[PDB]
Amino acid sequence: YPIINFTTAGATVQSYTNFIRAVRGRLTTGADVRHEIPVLPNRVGLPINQRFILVELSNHAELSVTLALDVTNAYVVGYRAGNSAYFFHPDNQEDAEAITHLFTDVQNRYTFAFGGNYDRLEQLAGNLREDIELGNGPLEEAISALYYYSTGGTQLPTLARSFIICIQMISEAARFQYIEGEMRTRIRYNRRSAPDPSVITLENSWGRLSTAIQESNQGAFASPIQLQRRNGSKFSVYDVSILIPIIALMVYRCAPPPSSQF
Numbered sequence: 001y002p003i004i005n006f007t008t009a010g011a012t013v014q015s016y017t018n019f020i021r022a023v024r025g026r027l028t029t030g031a032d033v034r035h036e037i038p039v040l041p042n043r044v045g046l047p048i049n050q051r052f053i054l055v056e057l058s059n060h061a062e063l064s065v066t067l068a069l070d071v072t073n074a075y076v077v078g079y080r081a082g083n084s085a086y087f088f089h090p091d092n093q094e095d096a097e098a099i100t101h102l103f104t105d106v107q108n109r110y111t112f113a114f115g116g117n118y119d120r121l122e123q124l125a126g127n128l129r130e131d132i133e134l135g136n137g138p139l140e141e142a143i144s145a146l147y148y149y150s151t152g153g154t155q156l157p158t159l160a161r162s163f164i165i166c167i168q169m170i171s172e173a174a175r176f177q178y179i180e181g182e183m184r185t186r187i188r189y190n191r192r193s194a195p196d197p198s199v200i201t202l203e204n205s206w207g208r209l210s211t212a213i214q215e216s217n218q219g220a221f222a223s224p225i226q227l228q229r230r231n232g233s234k235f236s237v238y239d240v241s242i243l244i245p246i247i248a249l250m251v252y253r254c255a256p257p258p259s260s261q262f
Ligand SMILES: OC[C@H]1O[C@H](O[C@H]2O[C@H](CO)[C@@H](O)[C@H](O)[C@H]2O)[C@H](O)[C@@H](O)[C@@H]1O
Pocket: 008, 009, 010, 011, 059, 060, 136, 137, 138, 140, 141, 187, 190
């Protein structure tokens, strides 16, 4: 599977930008674009040899871990650190079989009894996303935390917190130029801060936005989607147009209707 590298060591807006751009480049194929927004490969009919991509993360502490991302949703399904690999609890038998194709040479394979969704991870971390700082510092720390898990150096709450950090700074950033921008800003000013409502609501609405855009009538949503601004106030989305600078890719929801141009 394709590998994209990134290190928090001496990270800059440009190096992070290159990283996210490369990740998106391995996620979408260009075969499916709707209203100018790329769609991820459809799970249905997708060959296993094209199912995952790997993100090799390194940090200033000279530690490295490899995250595995599912190309169908850009989400993290597991990771490898040294001679051990850990996978989030699969949703079904097909996915359980699919992950056996990852880190096949690792000496110790483990599947967590818990899933990688935020609800579950927040419960295990003992903190909500709104209370977990993001930025290059948090990522640097998260990489070390993931690395030290197999030896008992990392407690479960810290592990979960670290997953929450990685997922948002990699998966959500790949999904939304807006979130990529949020991380770029944190890097530019070496600031670590929790995601505000605009970030949280986008993360929570990615699936719905993907469906709304794909089911839209020439871009017009059948029903509006409510997002939130930085101050928590409502922002109504009625059309795909307002999302062009915001969402970078979508999960496949339905087949694109015929061109049907006038
Ligand atoms: O801000 C750019 C640097 O970010 C990381 O380092 C910072 O994060 C560390 C862990 O929290 C802090 O100890 C340090 O004080 C922060 O500046 C990265 O590890 C550095 O290599 C980057 O230059």
